[PDB]
Ligand binder design. Structure first.
Ligand SMILES: *[C@@H]1O[C@H](CO)[C@@H](O[C@@H]2O[C@H](CO)[C@@H](O[C@@H]3O[C@H](CO)[C@@H](O)[C@H](O)[C@@H]3O)[C@H](O)[C@H]2NC(C)=O)[C@H](O)[C@H]1NC(C)=O
Lengths: 48, 52
């Protein structure tokens, strides 16, 4: 998350379209990734 | 005399005190990609890094 913010602020004031695009992509890519990670983790450690 | 020679394992320390300090320094390096006009963001980064 912090590196994503750093990239967004590096691209802001120069290429706002790319900054907004990567922000809008992260908004969905981070919660889904954390959800599937929790799914995998609890599934592999509650079955043993 | 019965004398042993115990070699300490470094996995736990790599886990507990080397990795957090390394990642804290990596975090501190982010303070350069922020624009030099931001006066509170880079100070917040540096202060939090020193404190951690
Ligand atoms: C751990 O530390 C101890 C002591 O600090 C080490 O013991 C030392 O081992 C050497 C090598 O065996 C001894 O030297 C010996 O001298 C006699 C003299 O006749 C000789 O006959 C032997 O062949 C050998 O050269 C030394 O005396 C001994 N320390 C003491 C105070 O006696 C030990 O090697 C260290 N390492 C381990 C894995 O224990």
């Amino acid at each position: 998350a912090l590196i994503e913010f750093a990239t967004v602020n590096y691209f802001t004031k120069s290429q706002p379209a790319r900054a907004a695009k990567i922000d809008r992509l992260s908004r969905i890519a981070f919660p889904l990734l954390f959800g599937i990670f929790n799914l995998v983790y609890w599934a592999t450690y509650l079955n043993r | 005399s019965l004398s042993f020679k115990l070699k300490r394992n470094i996995g736990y320390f790599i886990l507990q005190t080397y990795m957090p300090s390394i990642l804290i320094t990596i975090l501190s390096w982010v303070s350069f990609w922020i624009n030099y006009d931001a006066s509170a963001a880079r100070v917040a980064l540096g202060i939090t890094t020193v404190l951690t």
